[model samples]
Target chain A: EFDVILKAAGANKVAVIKAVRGATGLGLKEAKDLVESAPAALKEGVSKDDAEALKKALEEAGAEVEVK
Target chain B: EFDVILKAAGANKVAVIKAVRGATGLGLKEAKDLVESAPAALKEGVSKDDAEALKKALEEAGAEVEVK
Candidate 1:
């Protein structure tokens, strides 16, 4: 739920939202909703490798990667 | 400068602050100030694609991601 962890990983807000949304098949609003609902979880800390793995997982699921 | 986006994207605001601050060599107050000053730009909506790309950029720069 803490999507903010993605940002700490260097992901932009919208991009992280989209990736999670895509991987979970949740709509934009729903994605946003989920993140907002669980800020603590999403904002949890992660290692760089774990962050990349999350991104890779989302990408493999056909979600777009917007880190630039 | 909207570093808060980092907070919103599954990152601990404190950790994101550290990453950007480290990457840019900007002080904590300055980094926070920058984001506070440019909320709209940093908060501007981004695609899942753009978000991932941005994350990669920061990661390549040697940032520590705190995304769980």
Candidate 2:
């Protein structure tokens, strides 16, 4: 087992995979696999902070926000 | 009470207003008020079905895809 953090924006892609997996209870391999297969499809063109803010707005409006 | 469904993608703006209202439990006037206030902000450039699919994908990802 190993862990690696990539720098630059593309590195955040790993965090997204982790978030999706964490939210959905999917295995790391499974989550990583899915994200790897459909990189462009799941693109979120915003920084983590911005995404969190958007999520907070939705949650404040009484909606459940999940990653996967 | 009045219910109107418009065709053409642009006209779908009204449906989006109702959806935001319905999803957020905002009153009709309040909903219409919000939509009227921020027309461009809520634009959805697709048919109802496509929007629905996008919503479903987000939902499946455990995210609350709501419009304010």
Candidate 3:
């Protein structure tokens, strides 16, 4: 029941933003586009938690909850 | 909707899989943890589609669509 924050981020780096100053004018998140542009895939059988996490991450990163 | 497929992936690199062998055994997404570990923010503002896309990507990467 520890490292929830770290665990949350650890499990997925997309979400956890809106909750915190995850990247409010933080570092070079612009490169995120690079990842977005390049290719960011999930290896084995991924998880919805990750999807939601990434969804949350992407939602707060540049836009909002306007996805499908 | 010419690049609906590419546009889809272009819009978000997380989703687009499952339907396609995007990464059934693609690249070194293993390094995706590198990005995941480092951090993956959306920037400016994100969207639900992204979340869904990323969600799908993650969901199919290692697990499934069991997120929030």
Candidate 4:
């Protein structure tokens, strides 16, 4: 099992919020709140491929992500 | 003046390298080296807008960035 963690949202809060929404299918408010609460896990117990894909999507959207 | 610091390269190192390259116009090797050295500053004493943009770019590339 793998987990994708959001370490930081960077400077552009909007971008991070959008990235969170894109990666986790969360609503705008939820994403915003989640990003504001940095160092959080986006997804846990995912497959390697899924974790990688989520990391890619979040990265493309401008949010720093880690898989553990 | 603001400095854009790369806090972490996250899981996809390739993505972080590409992001550093894109944000700073550094070569692949330079970017890779920079990413490998975590908690490094990408650019220093830049304008807020520039720092924000850099942060956005790096984050999009899957790196954790902080503007200080």
Model 1's CAPRI class is incorrect
- Residue B41 shift from truth in candidate 2, angstroms: 40
TM-score-superior candidate, 1 or 2: 1
Give lDDT tens digits, candidate 1, residues B10-53: 33445555655443333344444433332212323445665565
Q: Is the docking of candidate 2 incorrect, acceptable, medium or high quality?
A: incorrect
Q: Docking quality tier of candidate 4?
A: incorrect
- For each candidate in turn, the interface RMSD (Å) is 12.7, 17.3, 8.7, 15.2
Best by TM-score: 4
Individual DockQ of the candidates?
0.03, 0.02, 0.08, 0.02
The TM-score, computed over Cα atoms with residue i paired to residue i, of candidate 3 is: 0.23
Question: lDDT, candidate 2, residue A25?
Answer: 33
lDDT of 2 by residue, B1-68 (tens): 11112122233446655565434333354334444433222213345665565455434433334432
Number of colliding residue pairs in model 3: 31
Q: Over 4 Å off in model 4, which ranges? A: A1-68
Candidate 4 to native Cα RMSD, angstroms: 14.3
Q: Write the per-residue lDDT of candidate 2 for residues A16-48, one digit (tens) a residue.
A: 555543333333544454445332222133456
**The 10-residue segment with the lowest total lDDT in model 2 chain B:** B1-10
Candidate 1, superposed: residue stretches over 4 Å from native:
A1-11, A37-52, A55-68, B1-68
Q: Could you tell me the C-alpha RMSD of candidate 1 in Å?
A: 15.3
State the lDDT of candidate 4 residue by residue for A4-68, as single tens digits.
78888778778777665545434354456557767776566678998898888878777778888
Off by over 4 Å in 3: A1-68, B1-33, B36-39, B42-44, B63-68
Question: TM-score, each model?
Answer: 0.25, 0.24, 0.23, 0.48
